[PDB]
Write a protein that binds this ligand. Structure first.
Ligand SMILES: [Mg+2]
Ligand SMILES: [Mg+2]
Lengths: 98, 121, 55, 104, 114, 67
RNA sequence: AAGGGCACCACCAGGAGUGGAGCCUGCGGCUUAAUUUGACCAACACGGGAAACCUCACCCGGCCCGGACACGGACAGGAUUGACAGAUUGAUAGCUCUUUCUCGAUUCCGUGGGUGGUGGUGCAUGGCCGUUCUUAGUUGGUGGAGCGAUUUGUCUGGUUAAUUCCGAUAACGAACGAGACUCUGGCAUGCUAACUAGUUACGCGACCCCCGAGCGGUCGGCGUCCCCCAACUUCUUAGAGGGACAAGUGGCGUUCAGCCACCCGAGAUUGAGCAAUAACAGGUCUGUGAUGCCCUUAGAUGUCCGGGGCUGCACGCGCGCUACACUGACUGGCUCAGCGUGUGCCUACCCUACGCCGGCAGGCGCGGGUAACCCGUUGAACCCCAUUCGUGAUGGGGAUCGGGGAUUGCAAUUAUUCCCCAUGAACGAGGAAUUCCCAGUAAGUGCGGGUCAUAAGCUUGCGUUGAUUAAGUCCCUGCCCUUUGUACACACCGCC
């Protein structure tokens, strides 16, 4: 995938800010619905999540026309040391109000 | 004589009043905007005609778009119209004005009927 | 090719513009009531939506 | 306040609609509001006809489906204000309610 | 009004939501003894109740997986934030649930049992 | 198959060495020997092309033609 | 082969037809680079398959990787990516080439390994559905018999649409199917409710009689849920209920199960849905991110883009429509429906009142309607009433073809559709054969929905008008039960 850094970090931090992310299967979608300001094509995020699944940091669930990627525990430390983050900031699903 | 006026007047017959000389389908076609592909083809034929040697026909120009409607300023060009398999070069006669380019490159050869096979018992 | 021709052909109408909302099929679509579901998929799920047989 | 409101209830079955239309008006009478009579609108029957087979080979047997949407209109009218009086909806799953006013 | 669709289309969309959510729960909670889905919608908010056998299995570490599914259903259908809640309910007489028994049979067959 | 045309030759890049298209003289005097792209999206950091009859900006994609 | 019963996917008596003509549409054949393909009662207006692009799977060509991950090279002294100009290209695909700029670690190369495919295989399969077979049939336990395969139960008889029931009985006790069941239509002047349905009464009105009526006639004109400023629910809606049970009378009947006739009753058989065991090498891998195995996967069988084709014609066949006319055609007037739809997650695309322009197809502005609130009281057709036509291929028929005008779209040519003026071809009731059908039925007749950017000769329903014949039979075509023969068991399309 030839997609740049500047959207790769954006997709990565969206994926880390909350434990999951939802993407419709449409490789010709002009714009992924959320992260609206970043103007990121849907094919780029689909293949980025495919690469992350291939390396095993995320597991994928497929309904009718949607992906339901679930970030795993091996996805925690990879996003942490890719985004250069101390192990205190967690996804919302991990720790709530505690 | 397309509509009683000669070809010379048709060369300087602008588009706005040319639609009143075309039929209904051609007038509706020219009422809607011609896309960039048609304009590029028109520029290509103009280039070929201006670079064509005097008293000699221009070179062949090819295209897939056979939905082009013939304009009087394209008369005398060598245009190769695709038939689905090859490009068919065709003259632009002074009688072809209201007709689409696709009518002059047939998409099938006419059938030569042979002996019927196993069917129609 | 680049973006100028990869998706240049319009699909703002017509049969290729519509697909099943389940299996993305392009044949036998049911546009009534905005169902947007394939004929096979509708027979599969009509109990789930609530279309039940009476007569 | 001076308020006159409209309450509409709709679902796919009649038992739930009837029990809501009964207990809600009974609570209204126990809460002494005069009630405009329940209006049962004509049913919307959503019919879909589909060939049973997924292939087209067969005896051309068509499967027909229905969806009966029944809706009831009840108007709660009191000399005083209404919304501060009644707030509890007491709505089971499967039935839809829209609460509007005379202005709306 | 103009913003809201007709009642017929609204009931159709509700049925579509029900079927899609049921399919998602089937494909996601297959190994967790999924039984069925029950949803309770109100104008205030919606309540989604999952019927399943292993509630402790569908619920992750301190409710991790239930939070994950709640976020998934929040994102995919675009509810207002905080307007959906997911309850996992243990079924009664799980031998009477054909879905659970069929899934258990499929699990047994995948285990290698005759 | 048996495609009548030969397999289309894909472009291979020129493998350019270190750029070095700017020179200073007598112990340091800057000499822009390449054209400046004046747009904001190009910026003043990048240079323009040095074609034999026009100038091209890598980012701004403007064409300054000298006749 | 016998015996009994049954069916308009059988017949009888009829009705309407089909096959005869034109056209539409689907198969075969022919031609083609391509006319993608499946399917041959139980395929042939079927794949909801009415394809200009898409659909597309076929052909002619051109791009992209949307080839993850891992290993090893490669590289910030550049891994590599985009692009102006020119040629080149159908293309304004930096696709390639000359030419330099520019992104910067995301890539590139090679090795494995993905992945995808409307690619193949329904004779590998799931699921679906069709057929056997919508006929009434099917099975367990225990017991009886037989060495056993098996048999009784599951039947002589009577009855039913029904192994439906009564009756006998080495059977007893069961279970499914049928029945029962749900929706539907028919009666409820009985109950509840009604400004998003009405009625009645009254008050304003408007017009005619006003000779003189005057509580005269009409109004789909305005009002009385505007909140004090009428009642009522018959007409409409939809809920709770009732109502019909062979219940009552006569007869037949072992007087049992039941059957015929009749009164009262809205109704003395409303149509559907579901629908057992076992099976088919029945159809779909071209519905699926249902899927095994095989094939391809970078010059792609992926994917996108351009065009053509799927319509192509010496010909055969299927379902349809139109007609062959006077029981008609045209012109004008009069007059009655019911299903059901209507503005969208992607998705842009709604139903449309009314006013104006145009002859029409259409266009131009004002609105209503997310809907018993607007289209709409759906002023429909058929039919009815009057005009003309006059037994002629004629004012029937509108196929073929010319010209012009609009609509949708990126694009209407191989004519999308529509409108106008032109031409009026066969066809004068159709051979041998053959389809469907018993009461609101066939048939005539229009209207919704599906497909739809634009669209119906198709289909699903709806309504309008509305019958002849019959209340039987096994003659043909078949089916069920019993007995019988068998040299068949892939089961007579057999075997020989
Ligand atoms: Mg005439
Ligand atoms: Mg013998």
């Amino acid at each position: 995938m030839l997609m740049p850094k500047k959207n790769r970090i954006a997709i990565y931090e969206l994926l880390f800010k909350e434990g999951v992310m939802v993407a419709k299967k449409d490789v010709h979608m002009p714009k992924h619905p959320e992260l609206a300001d970043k103007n990121v094509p849907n094919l780029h995020v689909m293949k980025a999540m495919q690469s992350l699944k291939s390396r095993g940091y995320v597991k994928e669930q497929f309904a009718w026309r949607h992906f339901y990627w679930y970030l795993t525990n091996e996805g925690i430390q990879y996003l942490r040391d890719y985004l250069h983050l101390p192990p205190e900031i967690v996804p919302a699903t991990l720790r709530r109000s505690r | 004589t397309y509509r009683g006026v000669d070809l010379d007047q048709l060369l300087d017959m602008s588009y706005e009043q040319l639609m009143q000389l075309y039929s209904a389908r051609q007038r509706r076609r020219l009422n809607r905007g011609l896309r960039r592909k048609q304009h590029s083809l028109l520029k290509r034929l103009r280039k070929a005609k201006k670079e064509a040697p005097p008293m000699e026909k221009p070179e062949v120009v090819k295209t897939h778009l056979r939905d082009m409607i013939i304009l009087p300023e394209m008369v005398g060009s060598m245009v190769g119209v695709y038939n689905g398999k090859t490009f068919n070069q065709v003259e632009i006669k002074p009688e072809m004005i209201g007709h689409y380019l696709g009518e002059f490159s047939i998409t099938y050869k006419p059938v030569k009927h042979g002996r019927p096979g196993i069917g129609a018992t | 090719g680049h973006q100028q021709l990869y998706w240049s052909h319009p699909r703002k109408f017509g049969q290729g513009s519509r697909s099943c909302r389940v299996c993305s099929n392009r044949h036998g679509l049911i546009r009534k009531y905005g169902l947007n579901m394939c004929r096979q998929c509708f027979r599969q799920y009509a109990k789930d939506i609530g279309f039940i047989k009476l007569d | 306040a001076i308020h006159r409101i409209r309450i509409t209830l709709t679902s796919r079955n009649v038992k739930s609609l009837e029990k809501v239309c009964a207990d809600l008006i009974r609570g209204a009478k126990e809460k002494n509001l005069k009630v405009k009579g329940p209006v049962r609108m004509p049913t919307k029957t959503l019919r879909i006809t589909t060939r049973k087979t997924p292939c087209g080979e067969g005896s051309k047997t068509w499967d027909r489906f229905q969806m009966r949407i029944h809706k009831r209109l009840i108007d709660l009218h009191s000399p005083s204000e209404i919304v501060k009086q009644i707030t509890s909806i007491s709505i089971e799953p499967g039935v839809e309610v829209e609460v509007t006013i005379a202005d709306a | 009004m103009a913003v809201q669709i007709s009642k017929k289309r609204k009931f159709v969309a509700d049925g579509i939501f029900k079927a899609e959510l049921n399919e998602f729960l089937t494909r996601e909670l297959a190994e967790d003894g999924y039984s069925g889905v029950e949803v309770r919608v109100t104008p205030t908010r919606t309540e989604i109740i999952i019927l399943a056998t292993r509630t402790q299995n569908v619920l992750g570490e301190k409710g991790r997986r239930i939070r994950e599914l709640t976020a998934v259903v929040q994102k995919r259908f675009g509810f207002p934030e905080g307007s959906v809640e997911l309850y996992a309910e243990k079924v009664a007489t799980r031998g009477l649930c054909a879905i659970a028994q069929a899934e258990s049979l499929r699990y047994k067959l995948l285990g290698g049992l005759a | 198959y048996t495609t009548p045309k030969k397999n289309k030759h894909k472009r291979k890049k020129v493998k350019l060495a270190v750029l070095k298209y700017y020179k200073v003289d007598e112990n340091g005097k800057i000499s822009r020997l390449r054209r400046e792209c004046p747009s904001d999206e190009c910026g003043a950091g990048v240079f323009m092309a040095s074609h034999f009859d026009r100038h091209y900006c890598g980012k701004c994609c403007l064409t300054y033609c000298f006749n």
